[PDB]
PDB file of N, CA and C and ligand atoms in Angstrom:
ATOM      1  N   UNK A  22      -4.210 -21.437 115.831  1.00 17.69           N
ATOM      2  CA  UNK A  22      -4.742 -21.898 117.101  1.00 17.69           C
ATOM      3  C   UNK A  22      -4.584 -20.808 118.207  1.00 17.69           C
ATOM      4  N   UNK A  23      -5.525 -20.394 118.975  1.00 19.69           N
ATOM      5  CA  UNK A  23      -5.318 -19.502 120.094  1.00 19.69           C
ATOM      6  C   UNK A  23      -5.694 -20.174 121.410  1.00 19.69           C
ATOM      7  N   UNK A  24      -4.773 -19.929 122.410  1.00 19.71           N
ATOM      8  CA  UNK A  24      -5.127 -20.393 123.689  1.00 19.71           C
ATOM      9  C   UNK A  24      -5.336 -19.280 124.683  1.00 19.71           C
ATOM     10  N   UNK A  25      -5.435 -19.601 126.040  1.00 17.54           N
ATOM     11  CA  UNK A  25      -6.001 -18.646 126.959  1.00 17.54           C
ATOM     12  C   UNK A  25      -4.783 -17.840 127.601  1.00 17.54           C
ATOM     13  N   UNK A  26      -3.582 -18.041 127.107  1.00 19.19           N
ATOM     14  CA  UNK A  26      -2.393 -17.257 127.649  1.00 19.19           C
ATOM     15  C   UNK A  26      -2.532 -15.804 127.301  1.00 19.19           C
ATOM     16  N   UNK A  27      -1.982 -14.956 128.086  1.00 21.21           N
ATOM     17  CA  UNK A  27      -1.992 -13.581 127.721  1.00 21.21           C
ATOM     18  C   UNK A  27      -1.411 -13.202 126.466  1.00 21.21           C
ATOM     19  N   UNK A  28      -0.095 -13.793 126.189  1.00 22.24           N
ATOM     20  CA  UNK A  28       0.430 -13.671 125.028  1.00 22.24           C
ATOM     21  C   UNK A  28       0.523 -15.017 124.291  1.00 22.24           C
ATOM     22  N   UNK A  29      -0.653 -15.597 123.812  1.00 26.47           N
ATOM     23  CA  UNK A  29      -0.696 -16.774 122.974  1.00 26.47           C
ATOM     24  C   UNK A  29       0.032 -16.406 121.719  1.00 26.47           C
ATOM     25  N   UNK A  30       1.142 -17.181 121.548  1.00 27.99           N
ATOM     26  CA  UNK A  30       2.087 -17.052 120.554  1.00 27.99           C
ATOM     27  C   UNK A  30       1.586 -17.705 119.246  1.00 27.99           C
ATOM     28  N   UNK A  31       0.323 -17.814 119.103  1.00 29.15           N
ATOM     29  CA  UNK A  31      -0.364 -18.386 118.025  1.00 29.15           C
ATOM     30  C   UNK A  31       0.453 -19.492 117.234  1.00 29.15           C
ATOM     31  N   UNK A  32       0.597 -20.745 117.995  1.00 26.80           N
ATOM     32  CA  UNK A  32       1.248 -21.867 117.358  1.00 26.80           C
ATOM     33  C   UNK A  32       0.492 -22.239 116.150  1.00 26.80           C
ATOM     34  N   UNK A  33       1.243 -22.312 114.972  1.00 27.87           N
ATOM     35  CA  UNK A  33       0.614 -22.608 113.725  1.00 27.87           C
ATOM     36  C   UNK A  33       1.399 -23.759 113.093  1.00 27.87           C
ATOM     37  N   UNK A  34       0.961 -25.014 113.341  1.00 32.19           N
ATOM     38  CA  UNK A  34       1.580 -26.239 112.871  1.00 32.19           C
ATOM     39  C   UNK A  34       0.636 -27.442 113.107  1.00 32.19           C
ATOM     40  N   UNK A  35       0.946 -28.438 112.380  1.00 32.23           N
ATOM     41  CA  UNK A  35       0.360 -29.817 112.545  1.00 32.23           C
ATOM     42  C   UNK A  35       0.742 -30.324 113.937  1.00 32.23           C
ATOM     43  N   UNK A  36      -0.140 -30.908 114.738  1.00 32.59           N
ATOM     44  CA  UNK A  36       0.110 -31.313 116.092  1.00 32.59           C
ATOM     45  C   UNK A  36       0.361 -30.231 117.092  1.00 32.59           C
ATOM     46  N   UNK A  37      -0.496 -29.893 117.916  1.00 33.14           N
ATOM     47  CA  UNK A  37      -0.293 -28.910 118.963  1.00 33.14           C
ATOM     48  C   UNK A  37      -0.570 -29.495 120.285  1.00 33.14           C
ATOM     49  N   UNK A  38       0.202 -29.240 121.372  1.00 33.77           N
ATOM     50  CA  UNK A  38       0.215 -29.854 122.704  1.00 33.77           C
ATOM     51  C   UNK A  38      -0.476 -28.835 123.577  1.00 33.77           C
ATOM     52  N   UNK A  39      -1.567 -29.322 124.299  1.00 36.54           N
ATOM     53  CA  UNK A  39      -2.295 -28.498 125.150  1.00 36.54           C
ATOM     54  C   UNK A  39      -2.245 -29.043 126.609  1.00 36.54           C
ATOM     55  N   UNK A  40      -2.521 -28.119 127.531  1.00 38.43           N
ATOM     56  CA  UNK A  40      -2.573 -28.444 128.983  1.00 38.43           C
ATOM     57  C   UNK A  40      -3.794 -27.568 129.644  1.00 38.43           C
ATOM     58  N   UNK A  41      -4.463 -28.229 130.556  1.00 39.24           N
ATOM     59  CA  UNK A  41      -5.562 -27.483 131.219  1.00 39.24           C
ATOM     60  C   UNK A  41      -5.134 -27.157 132.629  1.00 39.24           C
ATOM     61  N   UNK A  42      -5.667 -25.953 133.146  1.00 39.04           N
ATOM     62  CA  UNK A  42      -5.425 -25.549 134.403  1.00 39.04           C
ATOM     63  C   UNK A  42      -6.213 -26.299 135.451  1.00 39.04           C
ATOM     64  N   UNK A  43      -5.699 -26.658 136.569  1.00 35.61           N
ATOM     65  CA  UNK A  43      -6.355 -27.286 137.697  1.00 35.61           C
ATOM     66  C   UNK A  43      -6.826 -26.347 138.739  1.00 35.61           C
ATOM     67  N   UNK A  44      -6.242 -25.184 138.693  1.00 32.81           N
ATOM     68  CA  UNK A  44      -6.441 -24.100 139.624  1.00 32.81           C
ATOM     69  C   UNK A  44      -7.843 -23.583 139.737  1.00 32.81           C
ATOM     70  N   UNK A  45      -8.694 -23.928 138.748  1.00 30.20           N
ATOM     71  CA  UNK A  45     -10.136 -23.433 138.781  1.00 30.20           C
ATOM     72  C   UNK A  45     -10.711 -23.020 137.539  1.00 30.20           C
ATOM     73  N   UNK A  46     -10.049 -22.028 136.726  1.00 32.04           N
ATOM     74  CA  UNK A  46     -10.611 -21.485 135.587  1.00 32.04           C
ATOM     75  C   UNK A  46     -10.883 -22.578 134.605  1.00 32.04           C
ATOM     76  N   UNK A  47     -10.218 -23.695 134.665  1.00 29.90           N
ATOM     77  CA  UNK A  47     -10.480 -24.813 133.725  1.00 29.90           C
ATOM     78  C   UNK A  47     -10.391 -24.523 132.194  1.00 29.90           C
ATOM     79  N   UNK A  48      -9.454 -23.548 131.959  1.00 28.72           N
ATOM     80  CA  UNK A  48      -9.269 -23.215 130.563  1.00 28.72           C
ATOM     81  C   UNK A  48      -7.933 -23.869 129.980  1.00 28.72           C
ATOM     82  N   UNK A  49      -7.940 -23.926 128.702  1.00 29.91           N
ATOM     83  CA  UNK A  49      -6.833 -24.552 128.029  1.00 29.91           C
ATOM     84  C   UNK A  49      -5.698 -23.620 127.519  1.00 29.91           C
ATOM     85  N   UNK A  50      -4.486 -24.196 127.485  1.00 30.98           N
ATOM     86  CA  UNK A  50      -3.346 -23.455 127.099  1.00 30.98           C
ATOM     87  C   UNK A  50      -2.431 -24.323 126.188  1.00 30.98           C
ATOM     88  N   UNK A  51      -1.790 -23.648 125.192  1.00 32.67           N
ATOM     89  CA  UNK A  51      -0.783 -24.257 124.436  1.00 32.67           C
ATOM     90  C   UNK A  51       0.418 -24.501 125.387  1.00 32.67           C
ATOM     91  N   UNK A  52       0.977 -25.644 125.534  1.00 33.75           N
ATOM     92  CA  UNK A  52       2.134 -25.967 126.401  1.00 33.75           C
ATOM     93  C   UNK A  52       3.262 -24.955 126.232  1.00 33.75           C
ATOM     94  N   UNK A  53       3.538 -24.603 124.860  1.00 33.97           N
ATOM     95  CA  UNK A  53       4.595 -23.733 124.487  1.00 33.97           C
ATOM     96  C   UNK A  53       4.266 -22.385 125.076  1.00 33.97           C
ATOM     97  N   UNK A  54       3.047 -21.881 125.044  1.00 33.10           N
ATOM     98  CA  UNK A  54       2.679 -20.484 125.428  1.00 33.10           C
ATOM     99  C   UNK A  54       2.900 -20.356 126.963  1.00 33.10           C
ATOM    100  N   UNK A  55       2.891 -21.550 127.708  1.00 34.31           N
ATOM    101  CA  UNK A  55       2.978 -21.425 129.230  1.00 34.31           C
ATOM    102  C   UNK A  55       4.414 -22.019 129.623  1.00 34.31           C
ATOM    103  N   UNK A  56       5.235 -22.377 128.627  1.00 33.81           N
ATOM    104  CA  UNK A  56       6.605 -22.846 128.934  1.00 33.81           C
ATOM    105  C   UNK A  56       6.633 -24.077 129.850  1.00 33.81           C
ATOM    106  N   UNK A  57       5.958 -25.099 129.497  1.00 33.93           N
ATOM    107  CA  UNK A  57       6.011 -26.353 130.203  1.00 33.93           C
ATOM    108  C   UNK A  57       6.279 -27.564 129.400  1.00 33.93           C
ATOM    109  N   UNK A  58       6.876 -28.552 129.926  1.00 32.23           N
ATOM    110  CA  UNK A  58       7.247 -29.700 129.094  1.00 32.23           C
ATOM    111  C   UNK A  58       6.269 -30.866 129.442  1.00 32.23           C
ATOM    112  N   UNK A  59       6.005 -31.672 128.354  1.00 32.88           N
ATOM    113  CA  UNK A  59       5.165 -32.850 128.355  1.00 32.88           C
ATOM    114  C   UNK A  59       5.235 -33.658 129.658  1.00 32.88           C
ATOM    115  N   UNK A  60       6.393 -33.919 130.165  1.00 31.77           N
ATOM    116  CA  UNK A  60       6.619 -34.622 131.427  1.00 31.77           C
ATOM    117  C   UNK A  60       5.974 -33.894 132.545  1.00 31.77           C
ATOM    118  N   UNK A  61       6.303 -32.639 132.645  1.00 27.62           N
ATOM    119  CA  UNK A  61       5.614 -31.779 133.639  1.00 27.62           C
ATOM    120  C   UNK A  61       4.067 -31.615 133.531  1.00 27.62           C
ATOM    121  N   UNK A  62       3.646 -31.956 132.175  1.00 30.25           N
ATOM    122  CA  UNK A  62       2.229 -31.941 131.925  1.00 30.25           C
ATOM    123  C   UNK A  62       1.522 -33.133 132.484  1.00 30.25           C
ATOM    124  N   UNK A  63       2.092 -34.281 132.237  1.00 30.08           N
ATOM    125  CA  UNK A  63       1.391 -35.588 132.435  1.00 30.08           C
ATOM    126  C   UNK A  63       1.730 -36.108 133.913  1.00 30.08           C
ATOM    127  N   UNK A  64       2.807 -35.538 134.523  1.00 29.54           N
ATOM    128  CA  UNK A  64       3.171 -36.074 135.828  1.00 29.54           C
ATOM    129  C   UNK A  64       2.830 -35.216 137.031  1.00 29.54           C
ATOM    130  N   UNK A  65       2.551 -33.909 136.898  1.00 30.34           N
ATOM    131  CA  UNK A  65       2.183 -33.026 137.929  1.00 30.34           C
ATOM    132  C   UNK A  65       1.120 -32.066 137.606  1.00 30.34           C
ATOM    133  N   UNK A  66       0.476 -31.417 138.426  1.00 30.26           N
ATOM    134  CA  UNK A  66      -0.590 -30.526 138.283  1.00 30.26           C
ATOM    135  C   UNK A  66      -0.130 -29.267 137.677  1.00 30.26           C
ATOM    136  N   UNK A  67      -1.043 -28.398 137.035  1.00 31.59           N
ATOM    137  CA  UNK A  67      -0.667 -27.131 136.487  1.00 31.59           C
ATOM    138  C   UNK A  67      -1.680 -26.029 136.954  1.00 31.59           C
ATOM    139  N   UNK A  68      -1.110 -25.082 137.754  1.00 31.34           N
ATOM    140  CA  UNK A  68      -1.858 -23.901 138.086  1.00 31.34           C
ATOM    141  C   UNK A  68      -1.478 -22.779 137.228  1.00 31.34           C
ATOM    142  N   UNK A  69      -2.364 -22.188 136.464  1.00 34.84           N
ATOM    143  CA  UNK A  69      -2.091 -21.123 135.619  1.00 34.84           C
ATOM    144  C   UNK A  69      -1.757 -19.775 136.396  1.00 34.84           C
ATOM    145  N   UNK A  70      -1.496 -18.726 135.801  1.00 37.12           N
ATOM    146  CA  UNK A  70      -1.077 -17.475 136.433  1.00 37.12           C
ATOM    147  C   UNK A  70      -2.222 -16.891 137.294  1.00 37.12           C
ATOM    148  N   UNK A  71      -3.355 -16.792 136.650  1.00 35.96           N
ATOM    149  CA  UNK A  71      -4.565 -16.264 137.322  1.00 35.96           C
ATOM    150  C   UNK A  71      -5.122 -17.191 138.409  1.00 35.96           C
ATOM    151  N   UNK A  72      -4.849 -18.443 138.445  1.00 35.85           N
ATOM    152  CA  UNK A  72      -5.321 -19.395 139.418  1.00 35.85           C
ATOM    153  C   UNK A  72      -4.312 -19.633 140.515  1.00 35.85           C
ATOM    154  N   UNK A  73      -3.164 -19.068 140.349  1.00 34.62           N
ATOM    155  CA  UNK A  73      -2.080 -19.189 141.288  1.00 34.62           C
ATOM    156  C   UNK A  73      -2.393 -18.272 142.537  1.00 34.62           C
TER     157      UNK A  73
ATOM    158  N   UNK B  55      -1.185 -32.804 134.621  1.00 35.42           N
ATOM    159  CA  UNK B  55      -2.616 -32.581 134.557  1.00 35.42           C
ATOM    160  C   UNK B  55      -3.221 -33.019 133.349  1.00 35.42           C
ATOM    161  N   UNK B  56      -4.462 -32.563 133.038  1.00 37.21           N
ATOM    162  CA  UNK B  56      -5.184 -32.893 131.727  1.00 37.21           C
ATOM    163  C   UNK B  56      -4.432 -32.397 130.553  1.00 37.21           C
ATOM    164  N   UNK B  57      -3.961 -33.208 129.612  1.00 34.62           N
ATOM    165  CA  UNK B  57      -3.349 -32.669 128.386  1.00 34.62           C
ATOM    166  C   UNK B  57      -4.131 -33.048 127.161  1.00 34.62           C
ATOM    167  N   UNK B  58      -3.815 -32.610 126.054  1.00 35.82           N
ATOM    168  CA  UNK B  58      -4.521 -32.705 124.738  1.00 35.82           C
ATOM    169  C   UNK B  58      -3.599 -32.445 123.665  1.00 35.82           C
ATOM    170  N   UNK B  59      -3.833 -33.211 122.574  1.00 35.95           N
ATOM    171  CA  UNK B  59      -2.959 -32.990 121.356  1.00 35.95           C
ATOM    172  C   UNK B  59      -3.842 -32.773 120.192  1.00 35.95           C
ATOM    173  N   UNK B  60      -3.752 -31.539 119.517  1.00 34.55           N
ATOM    174  CA  UNK B  60      -4.606 -31.214 118.359  1.00 34.55           C
ATOM    175  C   UNK B  60      -3.891 -31.273 117.045  1.00 34.55           C
ATOM    176  N   UNK B  61      -4.427 -32.010 116.110  1.00 29.72           N
ATOM    177  CA  UNK B  61      -3.951 -32.194 114.747  1.00 29.72           C
ATOM    178  C   UNK B  61      -4.873 -31.675 113.669  1.00 29.72           C
TER     179      UNK B  61
HETATM  180 ZN1   ZN C1065      -1.347 -20.148 122.908  1.00 31.98          ZN
HETATM  181 ZN1   ZN C1066      -6.497 -21.227 135.692  1.00 31.24          ZN
END
């Protein structure tokens, strides 16, 4: 699986956690690849590096 | 934000 992060660490396993940018680009990222936790994912907004 | 889980 590949996400939109600069260094998508190509997470290869069953069950992958994703998060989408609110900042505009509306692209998807592996939560691992952007270093965020599920709580941070569901409770608050995420602005990616390009949309920041 | 919007999250997703892929299996
Ligand atoms: Zn990734
Ligand atoms: Zn973005």
